[PDB]
Amino acid sequence: VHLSSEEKSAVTALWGKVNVEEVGGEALGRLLVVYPWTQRFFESFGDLSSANAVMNNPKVKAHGKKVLAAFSEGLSHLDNLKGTFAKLSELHCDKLHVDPENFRLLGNVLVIVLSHHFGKEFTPQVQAAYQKVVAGVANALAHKYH
Amino acid sequence: VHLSSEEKSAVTALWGKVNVEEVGGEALGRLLVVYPWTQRFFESFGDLSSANAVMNNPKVKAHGKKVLAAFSEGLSHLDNLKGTFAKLSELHCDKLHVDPENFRLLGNVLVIVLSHHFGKEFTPQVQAAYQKVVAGVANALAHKYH
Amino acid sequence: VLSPADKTNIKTAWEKIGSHGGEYGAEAVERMFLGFPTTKTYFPHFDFTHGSEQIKAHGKKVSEALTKAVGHLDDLPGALSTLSDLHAHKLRVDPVNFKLLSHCLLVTLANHHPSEFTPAVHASLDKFLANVSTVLTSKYR
Amino acid sequence: VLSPADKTNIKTAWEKIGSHGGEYGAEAVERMFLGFPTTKTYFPHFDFTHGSEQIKAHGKKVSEALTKAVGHLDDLPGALSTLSDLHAHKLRVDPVNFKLLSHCLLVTLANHHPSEFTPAVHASLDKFLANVSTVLTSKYR
Ligand code: HEM
Ligand code: HEM
Ligand code: HEM
Ligand code: HEM
């Protein structure tokens, strides 16, 4: 993904303020609530039969943390997303059969959660740069389908 | 795309029987009728405000032939679809801004038209090999986004 | 959202499709499992050999459900809530898979009834299957 | 398809938006044009200057249209038929763009109403916008 220095500074500055424990859990939790077919992939986490069960579930928070840590890694490797995410794409595509459209939904939910957390600071301009980033990450996760 | 030698013979055998004059205009024509937003890309062709006007429009038939000639080329070049369709990916993605969902819709409409034309001969097995081919083509046309 | 004309196209096409409903069902499913092997992961207990009794029985049920739907175009959520319970609440089918079966059904109807499968009927049936899909993937009870 | 619970979440959350609909409207549209540049192709006569009176006037009309829908949840195709003629028949907007605007509206509501934008209300608003989007991309008259 190709960001101008202006875009990259903006993404990086905001990203340094992110609480990864908190944000990843809220993003993964909202994914499972808003798009309820996604709960099928996480059946082993226990009961996900309600918003309140999903958002209090410790495996969901711990997993959200792992997802966001992987996103952070993608952020300092933007010009090599494909190589960085190769094994991760293999796992999601070959072993888990996750349709690529679900990678886009999780990226957009993370953008919602950033807006929710940061308020005014998440300007339209900062948003626009993050959209480039989440699309880059979604693409990298899907490349093993190509 | 990787096809077994049995899949490749089934694909090429059936394709040899295709009326390159007519199937293209039938597939493009149906795309425009069934997914009416696609009409917006082809407004220079005249009135597409009904099924009859679409299917009888000569520019639709002339265009459908060009699409199919491209699918033919791809068939001779399955192990390098990306470089075969590089010029076409740039035209559709960078100049025209066709969302990639639309390539997939056209691929499936072409498989509908093949089934319509060939009947019993288009067996579930021949169809399955064709689904691998249209997916390869869609993905190759979408390469400039990724 | 179906127009008045879509409703007439669907009803009148479905009359022609008639007594062979069950057979088209079985064939559309088999085309889905072959064409899109990932869909088989929802059916771990099925025998997938081509003649399969299980596939033929399942094909028939999917056909009965569509026949029922055609009788209730003005109230699909109402007619189809038990199937929504199953698909949306219990099985949690990813909506992508509905676009695959819907495409296989059309492939199968164009195969057996090319005279009825005009561009305008193709259009109305696609929207019919999209509407049915939206009901079966939505939690509304 | 909206559940009775979804309907309540929508009506309740829309109460809290009060008189700022118009302003959220305009911001969601601005976020759309900037984050997804291909959307501007539908508005070749707009001035895209930040805070333009045109974008302001447009955001107002979008939020009026959503307020009206919230009032007619049991008959969206009924309430929104004129907007459907515009988007589906006249403009021929690719349905993909509706998902982008819907996303920008959610981003904007979460930005101004964090405490009302709970996971359950987010779920109901997403479904609300998807339902509205289907209607405005469907030709049904
Ligand atoms: C788009 C960004 C995504 C990222 C960065 C991501 C990241 C990750 C990571 C880092 C792991 C752990 C891998 C390991 O054990 O080394 C994982 C596992 C997993 N992911 Fe994702 N994921 C994404 C999207 C999705 C989506 C959308 C789904 C489902 C719809 C999903 C389903 C799963 C499942 C089921 C696991 C296995 C969890 C377990 O170990 O039980 N992922 N993912
Ligand atoms: C299998 C997928 C497709 C293939 C193989 C294909 C192929 C082609 C070809 C060969 C051309 C002519 C370029 C030339 O002058 O050499 C073309 C042009 C064009 N394509 Fe496609 N196309 C596909 C999908 C689509 C879709 C889905 C749309 C829009 C919904 C689209 C819209 C257009 C338009 C508007 C032109 C320019 C037509 C003109 O100015 O005459 N294409 N495409
Ligand atoms: C037009 C779309 C569909 C219709 C009308 C439909 C209809 C049906 C019907 C009538 C049944 C039997 C219900 C019963 O007797 O209790 C059923 C079961 C089932 N459906 Fe579907 N379905 C559709 C799409 C799908 C898709 C896309 C999938 C996943 C690929 C799927 C997965 C299943 C599964 C796993 C069962 C249970 C099978 C068993 O245990 O015997 N369905 N469906
Ligand atoms: C939540 C979905 C949407 C709603 C409720 C909505 C509502 C409206 C309204 C109220 C109008 C003004 C009607 C009038 O001219 O009197 C309008 C016009 C228009 N809409 Fe939308 N809209 C939606 C989505 C979209 C999308 C996704 C696009 C394309 C990106 C779009 C493109 C346009 C255009 C180009 C106009 C005419 C602009 C002008 O001439 O000033 N709309 N819409």
Coordinates of N, CA, C and O in Angstrom, one line a residue, chain C residues 80-138:
Chain C
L80 N -41.2 -18.2 6.1 CA -39.9 -18.9 6.0 C -39.1 -18.8 7.4 O -37.9 -19.1 7.4
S81 N -39.8 -18.5 8.5 CA -39.2 -18.2 9.7 C -38.6 -19.5 10.3 O -37.4 -19.4 10.9
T82 N -39.2 -20.6 10.2 CA -38.6 -21.8 10.6 C -37.2 -22.1 9.9 O -36.3 -22.7 10.5
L83 N -37.1 -21.8 8.7 CA -35.9 -22.0 7.9 C -34.8 -21.0 8.2 O -33.6 -21.3 8.2
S84 N -35.3 -19.8 8.6 CA -34.4 -18.8 9.2 C -33.8 -19.2 10.5 O -32.6 -19.1 10.8
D85 N -34.7 -19.6 11.5 CA -34.2 -20.3 12.7 C -33.1 -21.3 12.4 O -32.0 -21.2 13.0
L86 N -33.3 -22.2 11.4 CA -32.3 -23.2 11.1 C -31.0 -22.6 10.5 O -29.9 -23.0 10.9
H87 N -31.1 -21.7 9.5 CA -29.9 -21.3 8.8 C -29.2 -20.2 9.4 O -28.0 -20.2 9.5
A88 N -30.0 -19.2 10.0 CA -29.3 -18.1 10.6 C -29.0 -18.4 12.1 O -27.9 -18.0 12.5
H89 N -29.9 -18.9 12.9 CA -29.6 -19.1 14.3 C -28.8 -20.3 14.6 O -27.8 -20.3 15.3
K90 N -29.2 -21.5 14.1 CA -28.5 -22.8 14.4 C -27.3 -23.1 13.6 O -26.2 -23.5 14.2
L91 N -27.4 -23.0 12.3 CA -26.2 -23.4 11.4 C -25.2 -22.2 11.2 O -24.1 -22.5 11.0
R92 N -25.7 -21.0 11.2 CA -24.9 -19.8 11.1 C -24.1 -19.8 9.7 O -22.9 -19.6 9.6
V93 N -24.9 -20.1 8.6 CA -24.4 -20.2 7.3 C -23.8 -18.8 6.8 O -24.5 -17.8 6.9
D94 N -22.6 -18.7 6.3 CA -22.1 -17.5 5.8 C -22.9 -17.1 4.5 O -23.1 -18.0 3.7
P95 N -23.5 -15.9 4.5 CA -24.3 -15.5 3.3 C -23.7 -15.7 2.0 O -24.4 -15.9 1.0
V96 N -22.3 -15.6 1.9 CA -21.7 -16.0 0.6 C -22.2 -17.3 0.0 O -22.4 -17.4 -1.2
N97 N -22.5 -18.3 0.8 CA -22.9 -19.6 0.3 C -24.2 -19.6 -0.3 O -24.5 -20.4 -1.2
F98 N -25.1 -18.6 0.1 CA -26.4 -18.5 -0.5 C -26.3 -18.0 -2.0 O -27.1 -18.5 -2.8
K99 N -25.3 -17.1 -2.3 CA -25.1 -16.7 -3.6 C -24.6 -17.9 -4.5 O -24.9 -18.0 -5.7
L100 N -23.9 -18.8 -3.9 CA -23.4 -20.0 -4.6 C -24.6 -21.0 -5.0 O -24.8 -21.4 -6.0
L101 N -25.4 -21.3 -4.0 CA -26.5 -22.2 -4.3 C -27.5 -21.5 -5.3 O -28.0 -22.2 -6.1
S102 N -27.7 -20.2 -5.1 CA -28.7 -19.5 -6.0 C -28.1 -19.6 -7.4 O -28.9 -19.8 -8.3
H103 N -26.8 -19.3 -7.6 CA -26.2 -19.5 -8.9 C -26.4 -20.9 -9.5 O -26.8 -21.1 -10.6
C104 N -26.2 -21.9 -8.7 CA -26.4 -23.3 -9.1 C -27.8 -23.6 -9.5 O -28.1 -24.4 -10.4
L105 N -28.8 -23.1 -8.8 CA -30.2 -23.3 -9.1 C -30.5 -22.7 -10.5 O -31.1 -23.3 -11.3
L106 N -30.0 -21.5 -10.7 CA -30.2 -20.9 -12.0 C -29.6 -21.6 -13.2 O -30.2 -21.8 -14.3
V107 N -28.3 -22.1 -13.0 CA -27.7 -23.0 -13.9 C -28.5 -24.2 -14.2 O -28.6 -24.6 -15.4
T108 N -29.2 -24.7 -13.2 CA -29.9 -25.9 -13.4 C -31.3 -25.6 -14.1 O -31.7 -26.4 -14.9
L109 N -31.9 -24.5 -13.7 CA -33.2 -24.2 -14.4 C -33.0 -23.8 -15.9 O -33.7 -24.2 -16.8
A110 N -31.9 -23.0 -16.2 CA -31.6 -22.7 -17.6 C -31.2 -24.0 -18.3 O -31.5 -24.1 -19.5
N111 N -30.7 -25.0 -17.7 CA -30.3 -26.3 -18.3 C -31.6 -27.1 -18.8 O -31.5 -27.7 -19.9
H112 N -32.6 -27.1 -18.0 CA -33.8 -28.0 -18.2 C -34.9 -27.3 -18.9 O -35.8 -27.9 -19.6
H113 N -35.0 -25.9 -18.7 CA -36.1 -25.2 -19.3 C -35.6 -24.0 -20.1 O -36.0 -22.9 -19.7
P114 N -34.8 -24.2 -21.2 CA -34.3 -23.0 -21.8 C -35.3 -22.1 -22.5 O -35.1 -20.9 -22.5
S115 N -36.5 -22.6 -22.9 CA -37.6 -21.8 -23.5 C -38.2 -20.8 -22.5 O -38.4 -19.7 -22.8
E116 N -38.3 -21.2 -21.2 CA -38.9 -20.4 -20.2 C -37.9 -19.4 -19.6 O -38.3 -18.3 -19.2
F117 N -36.6 -19.7 -19.7 CA -35.5 -19.0 -19.1 C -35.0 -17.8 -20.0 O -33.9 -17.7 -20.5
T118 N -36.0 -16.9 -20.3 CA -35.7 -15.7 -21.1 C -34.9 -14.7 -20.2 O -34.8 -14.9 -18.9
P119 N -34.2 -13.7 -20.8 CA -33.6 -12.7 -19.9 C -34.5 -12.0 -18.9 O -34.0 -11.9 -17.8
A120 N -35.7 -11.7 -19.2 CA -36.6 -11.1 -18.2 C -37.0 -12.1 -17.0 O -37.0 -11.7 -15.8
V121 N -37.2 -13.4 -17.3 CA -37.4 -14.4 -16.3 C -36.2 -14.6 -15.4 O -36.2 -14.7 -14.2
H122 N -35.0 -14.8 -16.1 CA -33.7 -14.8 -15.4 C -33.6 -13.7 -14.4 O -33.2 -14.0 -13.2
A123 N -33.9 -12.5 -14.8 CA -33.8 -11.3 -13.9 C -34.7 -11.5 -12.6 O -34.2 -11.4 -11.5
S124 N -36.0 -11.8 -12.9 CA -36.9 -11.9 -11.8 C -36.6 -13.1 -10.8 O -36.7 -12.9 -9.6
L125 N -36.1 -14.2 -11.3 CA -35.6 -15.4 -10.5 C -34.4 -15.1 -9.7 O -34.4 -15.5 -8.5
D126 N -33.4 -14.4 -10.3 CA -32.3 -14.0 -9.5 C -32.7 -13.1 -8.2 O -32.3 -13.4 -7.1
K127 N -33.6 -12.1 -8.4 CA -34.1 -11.3 -7.4 C -34.9 -12.1 -6.4 O -34.7 -12.0 -5.2
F128 N -35.7 -13.1 -6.9 CA -36.5 -14.0 -6.0 C -35.5 -14.7 -5.0 O -35.6 -14.7 -3.8
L129 N -34.4 -15.4 -5.6 CA -33.4 -16.1 -4.8 C -32.7 -15.2 -3.9 O -32.4 -15.6 -2.8
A130 N -32.3 -14.0 -4.3 CA -31.7 -13.0 -3.4 C -32.6 -12.6 -2.2 O -32.2 -12.5 -1.1
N131 N -33.9 -12.5 -2.5 CA -34.8 -12.1 -1.4 C -34.9 -13.3 -0.4 O -35.0 -13.1 0.9
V132 N -35.1 -14.5 -0.9 CA -35.2 -15.7 -0.1 C -33.9 -15.8 0.8 O -34.0 -16.1 2.0
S133 N -32.7 -15.6 0.1 CA -31.4 -15.7 0.8 C -31.4 -14.7 2.0 O -30.8 -15.1 3.1
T134 N -31.9 -13.5 1.8 CA -31.8 -12.4 2.8 C -32.7 -12.8 4.1 O -32.2 -12.7 5.2
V135 N -33.9 -13.4 3.8 CA -34.7 -13.9 4.9 C -33.9 -15.1 5.7 O -34.0 -15.0 6.9
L136 N -33.3 -16.0 5.0 CA -32.7 -17.2 5.6 C -31.4 -16.9 6.4 O -31.0 -17.6 7.2
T137 N -30.8 -15.7 6.1 CA -29.6 -15.3 6.8 C -29.8 -14.3 7.8 O -28.9 -13.8 8.4
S138 N -31.1 -13.9 8.0 CA -31.4 -12.8 9.0 C -32.0 -13.3 10.3 O -33.0 -14.2 10.2

